[PDB]
Design a protein around this ligand. Structure first.
Ligand SMILES: [Zn+2]
Lengths: 71, 50, 52, 86, 100, 119
RNA sequence: UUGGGCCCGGCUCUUGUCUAUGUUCCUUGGAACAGGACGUCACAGAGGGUGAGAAUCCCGUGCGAUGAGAUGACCCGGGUCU
RNA sequence: GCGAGAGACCGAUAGCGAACAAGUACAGUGAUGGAAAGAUGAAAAGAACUUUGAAAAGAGAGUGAAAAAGUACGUGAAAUUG
RNA sequence: UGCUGUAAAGCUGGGUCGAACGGCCUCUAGUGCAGAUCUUGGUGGUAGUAGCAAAUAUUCAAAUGAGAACUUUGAAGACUGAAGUGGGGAAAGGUUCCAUGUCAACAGCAGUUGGACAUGGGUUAGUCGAUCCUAAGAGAUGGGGAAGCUCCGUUUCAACGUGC
RNA sequence: AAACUUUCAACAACGGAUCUCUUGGUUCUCGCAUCGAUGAAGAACGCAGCGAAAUGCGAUACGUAAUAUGAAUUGCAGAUAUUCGUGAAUCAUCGAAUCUUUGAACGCACAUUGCGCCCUCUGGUAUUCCGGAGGGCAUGCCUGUUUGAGCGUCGUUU
């Protein structure tokens, strides 16, 4: 997941199973004030939903990851 | 198969999570009687029936 | 004793010709109870003779 | 070839999971559960299968609401809140 | 099936009789609870008596003519002779029988 | 053990919702740190704090609706008594005590007397 | 001969709190709750726990006492207002 | 069903099928079928340490009243075996 | 270790063991086993025996390791021979996928290897499918049967638009 | 004579009988009347600092409030936790709540996490399109309200 934060400007989040890409795009905007280029989602073999959120070029995903605090 | 329903895939997720060994700190509890997980399941041996 | 003790089985005799005693036996498969004798006062898990 | 060779041709499920009882007794083509009788309003149950009633009856689940009717009855079906002592 | 000089019996036990066997294990318990019910009923209405006054009547049939026993209620004529209305009589511990 | 429910009951709608938001970012921050600690028992305290603030918000809003409907003929069914289905179908005391004028005249005319014997 | 409404009681139900007398001496034992000696209480020598068979070590038991909540056109006794 | 008190009842192949994560594991397409399985010790005090061994283990040692109680645990019969 | 009794049996010495148990007068019964192709559990002889023989076929060296017929790498010898022992999929399975560690059990020899065991990781869609359509058919409604569970019927003896 | 076979004893095996226990069962008695459209019984999926099950619970998820009580919990860890106290633990009690997806199961459908429509608010240059939040839309029957239909029918006017 961290290779995507660096290379592809993509933030990887665990997301609620009931939420769609419209709600995920709004949520990252409201929580972290960041614009998503797209949201690619995925339901994992353990039953949880994973979201690949690529940010627009205006945002550097590595800076956002440090701000959240997991890198 | 690769083409599966959501309801099928949700049952297969629970079956994976129930197929773990016993956490070892549980054997240290007072009046503990469980020595191992007695409900293990191997894919080739016992089928899920889903 | 319970009125139905030893009689909560669908056991049926295999009949003769299978080299076993003609006592009723549990059907089905996949458990170790399957094929075991039932209903008899001589049988483990059967009902007692003349239940009280 | 009615034994081992014919047993190799089993890949078409006659039953799938039932929405009411979750048991894999829902006949696909009949659209009926052989266990609970879904989608009929009543639950399938027979007096010639007393052991089957044991397997699925009141007390075999959570009784998340009947748990507390006795305790609510014993208090006369109170309305209001408990009063703090002075 | 029929052997020796014995009386011929009529033992009516060819149905599923064992499903309808009532054994009165609760005879003493019912006696005690019946006594407690009787005390509660008496203490509720004391000093008013628990029993209504019953008449005395001849037992029917040529076999019980000689005996006399307690009836169910006093007739309307009998209460009329003592100047008590049946509606009033029922409220002062007297039993009424419109049928006799 | 987190926030005190009696302190929460003295707050307005705006203050309770503001504290709920602060608690949720704290829980979100803890879940990020849980990736590395990984054992972080404080998560339990914040989770029960969110439950308390949500409880107080819900309870406070429910006496407001109760006060609005107080004395009204029709109120929401979740604010009605929840005895049992059968006890709700039962006759009220007024309906159960209804009596015909013929039956009321006879009850009054012939009450059960109080008396004794042997005097 | 006689209507109705409340207020305190009683009854009924549930529930809280409270209560006698050895852990004295010797022996065995890892442990005394065993044996022996001297006792104590008992309206309590039911039962359970505690390192072995414990009334007296602990919880209880027995005896009652005293609070809280309920409930009742269709239980009664008083008040009190119509 | 809920709440109690009992017994010349059974005592783990008995008593409910189930004294245990039992209507569980498991079987069957399905209706359904359906087990086995309680006991170290008062207390893990569940054997530190040394040594041989790749390791499992063994031998010393240690704890314990007892290791003729080491979890493959009270007692430990017979068949069968060295 | 013996004693007593015709006997069923009773008592006793030694060893083992660890929490209850017996004699006598009576009461009571789910009260006595060699058999029932008895029941459940356990154990033998057979017996280190039958056997582990289809699908052409393996060998040398090095590495690893306590240990190599079987693991890895290299060299060779072979085979499937494109209607494959190749490369994908549908059904079915469900994590078997991948990496790391790992050998008690399992892989009817072995095992350092594994679809085993343990810990983690992994499945990204406006365009590929589902989703939509109707097929044989299934089946509500209005009705009509049926004591009823329900049966018939599919626009049907209907005032049928959640119309545009 | 060994070996081997058989018998016996001691010790060690195999196995789990016997003995002794017992938070279980069985039977009898006593007392009580309380499921659900205010959504039951049941099902599925989740929830713990570290849990697979059982137990509990429902995105407020091994629980929230309240009342009572009064120092724990415990296998380890840890307070932005607590101790002459609004205070540890507590399904002790329990009257306030929360209660996912369902299920008689109710917008339609369901081998699909498929497809609508209405109201209010809100984002995207929008009465119409796309997104989000909240609230709604089943059937039979009863009482009532409103709007209607029929030369079924009464009165009146050409
Ligand atoms: Zn079903």
């Amino acid at each position: 997941a961290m290779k995507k934060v660096e290379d592809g400007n993509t933030l990887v989040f665990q997301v609620d199973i009931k939420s769609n890409k419209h709600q995920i795009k709004s949520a990252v905007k409201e929580l972290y004030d960041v614009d998503a280029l797209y949201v690619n989602t995925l339901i994992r073999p353990n039953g949880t939903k994973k979201a690949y959120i690529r940010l627009t070029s205006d945002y550097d995903a590595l800076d956002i990851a440090n701000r959240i605090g997991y890198i | 198969p690769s083409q599966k329903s959501f309801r099928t895939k949700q049952k297969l997720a629970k079956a994976q999570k129930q197929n773990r060994p016993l956490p070892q700190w549980i054997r240290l509890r007072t009046d503990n009687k469980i020595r191992y997980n007695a409900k293990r399941r191997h894919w080739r041996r016992t089928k899920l029936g889903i | 004793v319970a009125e139905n003790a030893g009689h909560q089985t669908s056991a049926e005799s295999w009949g003769t010709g299978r080299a076993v005693a003609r006592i009723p036996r549990v059907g089905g498969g996949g458990t170790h109870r399957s094929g075991q004798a039932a209903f008899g006062n001589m049988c483990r898990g059967g009902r007692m003779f003349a239940p009280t | 070839g009615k034994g081992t060779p014919s047993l190799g041709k089993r890949h078409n499920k006659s039953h799938t999971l039932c929405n009411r009882c979750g048991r894999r007794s829902f006949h696909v083509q009949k659209k009926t559960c052989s266990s609970c009788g879904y989608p009929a309003a009543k639950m399938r149950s027979h007096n010639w299968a007393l052991k089957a009633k044991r397997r699925r009856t009141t007390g075999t689940g959570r009784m998340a609401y009947l748990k507390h009717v006795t305790r609510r009855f014993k208090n006369g079906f109170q309305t209001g809140v408990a009063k703090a002592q002075t | 099936a029929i052997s020796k000089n014995l009386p011929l019996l009529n033992n009516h036990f060819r149905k599923h009789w064992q499903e309808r066997v009532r054994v009165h294990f609760d005879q003493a318990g019912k006696k005690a609870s019946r006594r407690q019910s009787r005390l509660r009923k008496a203490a509720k209405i004391a000093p008013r008596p628990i029993d209504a006054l019953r008449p005395v009547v001849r037992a029917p049939t040529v076999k019980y003519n000689r005996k006399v026993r307690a009836g169910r209620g006093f007739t309307l004529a009998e209460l009329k002779a003592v100047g008590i209305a049946p509606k009033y009589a029922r409220t002062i511990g007297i039993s009424v029988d419109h049928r006799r | 053990a987190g926030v005190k429910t009696f302190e929460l009951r003295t707050k307005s709608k705006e203050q309770l919702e503001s504290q709920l938001v602060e608690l949720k970012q704290e829980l979100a921050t803890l879940k990020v740190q849980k990736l590395q600690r990984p054992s972080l028992p404080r998560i339990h305290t914040v989770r029960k704090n969110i439950a308390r603030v949500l409880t107080v918000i819900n309870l406070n809003q429910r006496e407001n609706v109760r006060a609005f409907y107080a004395g009204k003929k029709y109120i929401p069914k979740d604010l009605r008594a929840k005895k049992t289905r059968a006890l709700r179908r039962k006759l009220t005391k007024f309906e159960a005590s209804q009596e015909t004028e013929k039956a009321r005249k006879q009850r009054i005319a012939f009450p059960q007397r109080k008396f004794a014997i042997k005097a």
